[PDB]
Amino acid sequence: QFPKLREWIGQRVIKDMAAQGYQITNKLFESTVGVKRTDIEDDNLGVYGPL
Amino acid sequence: QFPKLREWIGQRVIKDMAAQGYQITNKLFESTVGVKRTDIEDDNLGVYGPL
Amino acid sequence: AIITPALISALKTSFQKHFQDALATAPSTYLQVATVIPSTTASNTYGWLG
């Protein structure tokens, strides 16, 4: 934040300011499922149709 | 660089490379000289021209 | 008073690639000493008479 406003008495005051910092590292996730071709892909998509 | 080509024996081997880095930070410089306006303007010498 | 991670180190720095592929390798010279012979099978056999 910027310094609070001040009444004038003689001379200005320079004051100071600060800054912050935050760091984050990524992660990798997955999920896999196994299905045999004949089950539905060659016969019919009765299940896993909405896979 | 890469691992040099070697005879393909037994089983293929996966290798890895190397990376390098270098940093250098700039510096700030100054040079000042002071003179009086009256002195330079009251100068019919022709000197102090190529300041 | 910014914290060091966001300083000249990382925040104020520009990446350059002037050093890339600048150190070369010794020039090829095998042609001056050797000749190239093509092949189209497992091996090659050479024969001369005498």
Side-chain angles (χ1 to χ4, degrees):
Chain A
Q1 269 177 7
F2 210 80
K4 182 174 72 68
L5 277 296
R6 179 196 83 108
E7 182 65 26
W8 291 58
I9 182 70
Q11 197 65 266
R12 73 170 79 187
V13 186
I14 310 311
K15 310 286 279 179
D16 300 277
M17 263 165 78
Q20 310 279 319
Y22 189 38
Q23 184 62 264
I24 312 93
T25 300
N26 276 314
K27 298 289 194 61
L28 193 72
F29 300 87
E30 57 87 29
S31 189
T32 317
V33 158
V35 194
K36 85 198 154 193
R37 292 156 75 192
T38 65
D39 178 36
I40 53 170
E41 271 78 24
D42 170 60
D43 306 338
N44 190 4
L45 279 81
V47 298
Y48 314 77
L51 195 157
Chain B
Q1 293 209 326
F2 278 35
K4 55 180 72 178
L5 183 57
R6 61 93 169 171
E7 182 65 26
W8 199 347
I9 296 151
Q11 202 269 313
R12 182 175 270 294
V13 175
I14 311 308
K15 294 181 176 67
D16 52 2
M17 293 177 70
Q20 308 274 330
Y22 185 58
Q23 189 191 12
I24 191 71
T25 299
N26 300 282
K27 298 187 175 271
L28 165 55
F29 309 100
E30 61 86 20
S31 186
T32 175
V33 65
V35 71
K36 283 70 62 167
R37 67 177 173 173
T38 300
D39 269 308
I40 65 173
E41 72 195 347
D42 286 338
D43 166 58
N44 47 349
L45 270 164
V47 183
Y48 295 162
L51 172 62
Chain C
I2 177 65
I3 58 162
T4 302
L7 265 293
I8 318 303
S9 70
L11 183 61
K12 279 82 75 174
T13 198
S14 176
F15 192 68
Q16 305 275 122
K17 65 179 73 174
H18 277 257
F19 293 100
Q20 187 45 54
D21 63 31
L23 287 185
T25 306
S28 284
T29 48
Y30 77 105
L31 279 181
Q32 293 190 330
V33 302
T35 183
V36 185
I37 306 172
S39 179
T40 73
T41 191
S43 77
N44 264 18
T45 290
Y46 312 85
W48 57 105
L49 174 48

